[PDB]
Amino acid sequence: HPCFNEKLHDRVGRVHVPIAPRCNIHCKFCTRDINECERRPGVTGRLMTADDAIKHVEKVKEEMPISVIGVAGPGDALANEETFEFFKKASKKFPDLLKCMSTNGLLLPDRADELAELGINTVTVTVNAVDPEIGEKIYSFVVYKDKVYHGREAFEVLSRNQLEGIEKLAERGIIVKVNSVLIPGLNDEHIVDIAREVKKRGASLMNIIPLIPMGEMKDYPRPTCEQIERVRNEVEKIIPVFRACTQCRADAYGIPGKKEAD
Ligand code: SF4
Numbered sequence: 001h002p003c004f005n006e007k008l009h010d011r012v013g014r015v016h017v018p019i020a021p022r023c024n025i026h027c028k029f030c031t032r033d034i035n036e037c038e039r040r041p042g043v044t045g046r047l048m049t050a051d052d053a054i055k056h057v058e059k060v061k062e063e064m065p066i067s068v069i070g071v072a073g074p075g076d077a078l079a080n081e082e083t084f085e086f087f088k089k090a091s092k093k094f095p096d097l098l099k100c101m102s103t104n105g106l107l108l109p110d111r112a113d114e115l116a117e118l119g120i121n122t123v124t125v126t127v128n129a130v131d132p133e134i135g136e137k138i139y140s141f142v143v144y145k146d147k148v149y150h151g152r153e154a155f156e157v158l159s160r161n162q163l164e165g166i167e168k169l170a171e172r173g174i175i176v177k178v179n180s181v182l183i184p185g186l187n188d189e190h191i192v193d194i195a196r197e198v199k200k201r202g203a204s205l206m207n208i209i210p211l212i213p214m215g216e217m218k219d220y221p222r223p224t225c226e227q228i229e230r231v232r233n234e235v236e237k238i239i240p241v242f243r244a245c246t247q248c249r250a251d252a253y254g255i256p257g258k259k260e261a262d
């Protein structure tokens with residue numbers, strides 16, 4: 001799996017299906033939109049249907065290697081009812097490709113059973129904070145069940161559900177990755193605590209990614225390739241760490257060295 005280790009990243013391939021529009025939370029740096037050509041995390045060039053995603057994976061698996069397929073669509077992959085239809089239709093069409101996902105962890109406590117039934121191998125959870133005094137200044141609102149949270153309670157609900165979901169996915173038998181965005185000034189001296197609690201829950205690999213201030217933030221400075229390495233090596237002594245994150249789009253297909261983007 002190219003998203004793990006660091007060597008297959010230039011040799012193994014993956015597919016992203018833009019099959020998860022609309023999210024259930026609001027991060028202080030989200031853009032999404034269909035900006036055609038842009039290497040943003042949530043910048044899909046064109047949304048697709050579950051069957052169109054099947055056709056896309058089928059048309060790309062022959063002219064490209066492809067080791068995994070992943071639903072890292074614009075919104076939360078658990079927030080869209082098309083991700084599960086995609087994985088169900090793909091479980092019996094190409095059972096050879098590993099099935100990955102990029103979630104926020106909020107809808108993991110109820111959908112861990114469904115992720116296990118769909119044959120999911122790996123799920124990465126975007127954990128950006130665990131101390132409420134830090135996470136209250138990263139998120140705006142969280143819509144859970146049938147109610148919307150917006151203050152410190154929003155982060156409390158989000159963190160509780162995401163951590164319980166990490167534990168549930170680890171107990172069910174699914175390797176979970178932890179993406180954490182290094183925002184200089186908020187969670188810079190906090191990634192080690194995130195690593196402690198996430199490893200206590202059951203994380204295998206952690207992917208520290210630099211902040212891209214292409215969001216609701218007043219363009220904070222990007223964490224220097226020195227501080228991103230200082231925190232990275234300070235965390236490596238608690239949990240294995242990934243070190244080749246190109247911040248892929250939501251429509252990338254192929255090997256992440258010569259990938260396409262619709
Ligand atoms: S989710 Fe993140 S890691 Fe898993 S496949 Fe899609 S991109 Fe690679």
Ligand code: SF4
Binds near residue numbers: 104
């Ligand atoms: S999770 Fe992805 S989509 Fe939902 S808000 Fe944070 S960034 Fe925007």
Ligand code: SF4
Binds near residue numbers: 244246248
């Ligand atoms: S996002 Fe980071 S981890 Fe997911 S694929 Fe692009 S690089 Fe590998």
